[PDB]
Every structure is written in C-alpha cells, then in structure tokens.
Design a protein around this nucleic acid. Structure first.
Lengths: 105, 100
DNA sequence: CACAGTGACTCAGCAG
DNA sequence: GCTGCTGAGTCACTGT
C-alpha cells in the first residue's frame, strides 16, 4: 500500500488511486459526481491526480530530452556524410569541366 | 550561525572544527544541510552540462545544414552549365563529322 | 476550468 | 563514512 493509497483510505476516498490518476476527465467527473466530498477529500483527490499525471510527464520530458540528443548526434553524422558525398560530386563536376575546358583551351 | 555558501565550501574536517554549542541532533542537521546544498550543486552542474551539450550540438548542426544546402545548390547550378557546355561540344561533334 | 511541458529542488540509492 | 552522480517525484510555473 503506497502512501497515496493510505492517505486516501484515511480520508475515506472510496476510489482507487489508479482510477483517480488514469481515468479520463469525463469519466473522472462522472465517478466524482453524486459524491458529498468535503474540501479535505477534494483537495487530496486533486493532489493525487495532479502528482500522478505530472509524474508521467516528467518521465516523458526526460525521455524526450535524451532521445533528442541521440537524434541530434545522428543528424550530425548524416550531415558529415552528405557533405562528403556532395564534395565528391563537386570534384567529378570540377574535373569534367576542367577536362572539357582543357580540350578547348 | 552559518550561511549557505560557507557550508558547501568547507570539508568534513573543517566542519568538525565548528561544533561550538550544538547538540548531537544539530550535528546531523547541519551535516544534512551540507549534503542537500551539495546535491543542489550537483544537479545544477548536471543541467549545465546537458544544456551545453545540446546548444553546442545544435549550433554545429545548424552550420552543417547550411553548408550542405549551399553545396547542394551550387553543384546543381554548376552541373547545369556543365551539361550545357557538353551539349554544345556534342553539337560540334556532329558538325565536325558532316564535313569532308 | 482542464492538462501537458519544463526548470529547479529534493531525496533515495548506487558506485567508488 | 564521503563524493559525485543520476533516476525519479514534486513544486511552480507557462502555454494550449
């Protein structure tokens, strides 16, 4: 039993914590409807929901941060390869032009 | 008392030199304050490291993108004039053959 | 109002 | 034990 589950239990929150967190808004409101909660119960429910949602955005935010550096590092690689492929093409273009310009002075 | 920056700078030996008028419980409290402030510095320098990594990577990616864009564009222009010159060289091919 | 994204702080916990 | 680090949860915002 997590600390969140104990507090909700101690305040007689009849809903499971997972349903407080993960349920969509319309379904959360439906579950919350027809309930005579007091301020303390309302506050703890909203605090459990906010912390629960924000905990996952924090992981996603950190996951995207690291993933973005991998994509940047790859971006770097491909550009250094494309630059080399482009310089190779420029060389064969410069050689063909020079050879034709030579044959005609 | 003591301030924040002063606690982080000193070591454990100097910290043992400032036990004037405190209980055993105030000892661990002050030690835990140092570890907390040290942890704040660790996390902060960790953030600065990753921000420096990202900015430096992005600034040097934004370069290479313009580098290959300028290269791709100029090669396109050059291969045009290069194809046109070879076309007229090939036109003089056929005319040189038509004479006897 | 709702919720997602994010810098800063915090702490647990691991490695050395 | 301490150090430095890092994943993770929480706060306090900002933005849609």
């Amino acid at each position: 039993l997590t600390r969140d589950e104990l507090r909700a239990k101690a305040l007689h929150i009849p809903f499971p914590v997972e349903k407080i967190i993960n349920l969509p808004v319309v379904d959360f409101n439906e579950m919350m409807s027809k309930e005579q909660f007091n301020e303390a119960q309302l506050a703890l429910i909203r605090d459990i929901r906010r912390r629960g949602k924000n905990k996952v955005a924090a992981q996603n935010c950190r996951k995207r941060k690291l993933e973005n550096i991998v994509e940047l590092e790859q971006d770097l690689d491909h550009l250094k390869d494309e630059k080399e492929k482009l310089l190779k093409e420029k060389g064969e273009n410069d050689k063909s032009l020079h050879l034709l310009k030579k044959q005609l002075s | 008392s003591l301030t924040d920056e002063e606690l982080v700078t000193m070591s454990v030996r100097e910290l043992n030199q400032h036990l004037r008028g405190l209980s055993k419980e105030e000892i661990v409290q002050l030690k835990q304050r140092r570890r907390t402030l040290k942890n704040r510095g660790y996390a902060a320098s960790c953030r600065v490291k990753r921000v420096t990594q990202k900015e430096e990577l992005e600034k040097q990616k934004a370069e290479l993108q313009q580098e290959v864009e300028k290269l791709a564009s100029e090669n396109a222009s050059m291969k045009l004039e290069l194809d046109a010159l070879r076309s007229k060289y090939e036109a003089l091919q056929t005319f040189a053959r038509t004479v006897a």
